[PDB]
Amino acid sequence: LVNVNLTKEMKASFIDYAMSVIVARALPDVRDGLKPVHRRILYGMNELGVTPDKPHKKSARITGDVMGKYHPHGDSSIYEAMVRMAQWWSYRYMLVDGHGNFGSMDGDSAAAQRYTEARMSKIALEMLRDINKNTVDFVDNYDANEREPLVLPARFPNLLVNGATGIAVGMATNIPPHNLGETIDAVKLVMDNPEVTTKDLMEVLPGPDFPTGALVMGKSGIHKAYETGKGSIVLRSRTEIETTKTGRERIVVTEFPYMVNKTKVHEHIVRLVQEKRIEGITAVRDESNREGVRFVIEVKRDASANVILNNLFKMTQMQTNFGFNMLAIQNGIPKILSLRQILDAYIEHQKEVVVRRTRFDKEKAEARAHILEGLLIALDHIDEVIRIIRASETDAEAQAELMSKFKLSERQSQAILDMRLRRLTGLERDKIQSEYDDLLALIADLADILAKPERVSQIIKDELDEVKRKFSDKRRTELMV
Amino acid sequence: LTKEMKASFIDYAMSVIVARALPDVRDGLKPVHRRILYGMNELGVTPDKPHKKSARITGDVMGKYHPHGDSSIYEAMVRMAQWWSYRYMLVDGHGNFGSMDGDSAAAQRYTEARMSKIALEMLRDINKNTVDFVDNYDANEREPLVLPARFPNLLVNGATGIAVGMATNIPPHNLGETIDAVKLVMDNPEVTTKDLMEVLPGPDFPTGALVMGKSGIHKAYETGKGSIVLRSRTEIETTKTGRERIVVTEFPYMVNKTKVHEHIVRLVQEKRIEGITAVRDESNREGVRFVIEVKRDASANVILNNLFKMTQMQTNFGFNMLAIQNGIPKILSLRQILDAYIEHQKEVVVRRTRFDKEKAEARAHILEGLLIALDHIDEVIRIIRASETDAEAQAELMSKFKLSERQSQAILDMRLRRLTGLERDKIQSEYDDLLALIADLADILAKPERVSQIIKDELDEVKRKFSDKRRTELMV
Amino acid sequence: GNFGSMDGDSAAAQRYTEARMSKIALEMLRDINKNTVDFVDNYDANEREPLVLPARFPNLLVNGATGIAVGMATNIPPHNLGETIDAVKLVMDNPEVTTKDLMEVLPGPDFPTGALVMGKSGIHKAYE
Lengths: 481, 476, 128
Known about the structure:
This is part of a larger assembly, with 3 copies of chain A.
Chain A: H1 7-24, H2 36-47, E1 57-58, H3 59-69, H4 75-84, E2 96-98, E3 117-120, H5 124-127, H6 158-162, H7 181-192, H8 198-202, E4 215-217, H9 220-228, E5 231-236, E6 239-243, E7 249-253, H10 262-274, E8 281-286, E9 295-299, H11 305-315, E10 320-324, E11 329-330, E12 333-334, H12 339-380, H13 382-391, H14 395-406, H15 410-417, H16 426-451, H17 454-470, E13 478-479
Parallel strand pairs in A: 4-13
Antiparallel strand pairs in A: 1-3, 2-3, 4-5, 5-10, 6-7, 7-9, 8-9, 11-12
Helix pairs in contact in A: 7-17, 12-15, 12-16
């Protein structure tokens, strides 16, 4: 069978086994927290240029395209994450704009692979634009040729606020979600104020949010989990007693906390009927739910319906003991972070992002500056260089005489030599001079941004406010003590 | 009314006859086959690349024109692959085409073909405005009504017409014999029919036969009417047991072996010579082994004359020998094919000369502008520095020297690489070369015999490239 | 598909041209093995085409014809089939019958819509 005798290669293959199973499935990353397959989806959708501006497209074709541009990995988790980042209700924020059959929230994952027709959302335009941006190393695949980026850089801790699902690999962890607006607020307060305290930002930060809209009670678990990320908290559904025209009372729920089925709990209600461990209950009904979710339990008189609500949030699954585990990974090794340290690593990432983008733009401007330096030096002593080309013979003689007379490089001399008559009007000569000084002003501006670091902070805050303007984030949940 | 009905009769009869009856004198190439070769040249894919297996070619053909069947277009393809029927050669192909056997190759697109070697030089000079064009009914692409030629294929491949008024037999001939006939009529406008007997000893076949007559050939090349003998080859050899064995290789043309053999079996089996149960007619993939053995107490020659009376081993092959030119049919003789091909090639060469003068004098005008630019430069530079517009620069150049608009703008098309003096001498050298070639073409245009010499040049080109002998062994 | 019923709207949906035939060609012609009709050859003169349509049936006598504007005009007006079979079989078993006694067998020239016919002098002229 095995007959493998060398324990050393067993240990080495076992370390690669463990770390590769880590790297494969979902991890608390530095910059996106995502699966690498998510990164694959995003980078393929970007570099194919499939915008939401353009119309919809059959997406299983795109799935096979990305699968063929990448490794021959299995289709299952691919199509799973394809659905998951198109599910509007599960992830708090919108990524993939599907068009087909999914199942709403009640245990029917419709998997119509033929009908896989979709687009994306407009938030990847805020997520990543690294076309020219020297940011991230690449790994090569098909006989080691074609790029794949290591990480997903951004200007945005959105995926902090999204939430994570990486549990069964080694030890368990997740990321519970918040909303974005007060996140922007507390972040900018740390930006302009690098020496703030936790609880004063808890004054800025409400509870961990949920897309359905949850009733939150208690803050001791909030105190523990904003610090150390461990503990379960209690969650209740928006549930009311309503009187009829007859005086009969009605238990009316609006939503539920996270990871709840209507139908499994409904079967559990029918159990509780036939289990004969709860009384009073008459009608278990649910209709018209697509204009708005409306599930109604209706109970006879002389029953103490609020005590029955107490019995619901004691024994039924309507009560939620929602636990946290945010056990981080920063450059491979597992860690654990406070809410400050997350944003700190975000800050220094934005530092490196804007610095490297500015240096790429710097080298753009420097190269074009050397171009226009050569142009203006050609404009200096024109007829002498006319005599030069009327005299000399070769590339070597021309470059030697131009370097002796004007101290320029070879490419500069040849770009001089590539000047035609139709770029010899004094109009375009002074337009060269004008755009030359424009780029000089841009170089000086970027050097001034290199002088002081806080301009980066200010521009980040500006475009955070732009995103919060285009993406107003009202609340949906409710916190109590 | 009835005059308009007569107009419809005349015009529609012209449509049908020019459609599917005899082609022009100028090409000898039927317009179906003409468009086959034109679209296969406009495939562009060389015969050097391996020849294709597709009906996409014929789909573009049917997009070029709607017939009463593209299966007939494929029939035209296959009948131009019939080397055993139509001579050398118009198809570079691979697929099933059979022989003169009764073969049915239903695999239509499954055959391979592309351009052929003779077609390559046969249809050059499209890029020289030599031949006129007409638009299709589809109003999108054009087509030529005639073709340029490098030989009278009229004589190379014959004609087997249909009787719309009457059909037409035209026999094939030989390559180099036709070349010698061209040279003969070129050197002498005073040739005779015996001269034609010299440079053409006789019409030949891709298979071979025997033509015993002489004056039928004489009336064929003079009157255009007459019938000949087509005879099978006969070889009388000795069986080891004493039988006058008959070996046959050649045959009359358009004569399958199969039904002839069946009628021979019938004539045996109708109370006649029945002891000839010896018909060894096989192994014909090396050649033709059509061997019988005459029975004992019977001579071979009587059975030979009886099968000549069966009109299949000896056949009166007639000739109608008609043609189409200037919208009319015509009874044929030589100095008509001959002078027609001569003056057609005159048209082609002279119009090619005119087009080459067009290109050469246009480029000469360019290099005029180039050398006049390279005379004096820096003053033009400094006056350009006193300007800000290419229209102003054009007006400045018109004030400076005599140029064209194209010349002025091409002088504006000068980077700094253009500012040397060696390339001045190079442009001057090619300028004098081009002036010398223009004067050469003008002197050739003031030379009638030089055209004939160019015709001799192309004849010697195709003669060094190819030749063919008389495979059809003819005794008279 | 789409045709238009009888009121001047010839629907010509060439894309929608989806069809079958009727079961009467099984009575019309079965010449597979049947040495009946010469053939003419087309694409470089190879493939068959029959000269005529033989049958066992004068059905197309009873159908009707439309050949008018070519030279002079002619048609074939239709009958029905049953009394046609009757009068034909009477001529078969009786080769020496008269016209009007078969007009006793043959009603007027028929029409598919169902027409009111008056008069028989034109019937006398046109059957002759």
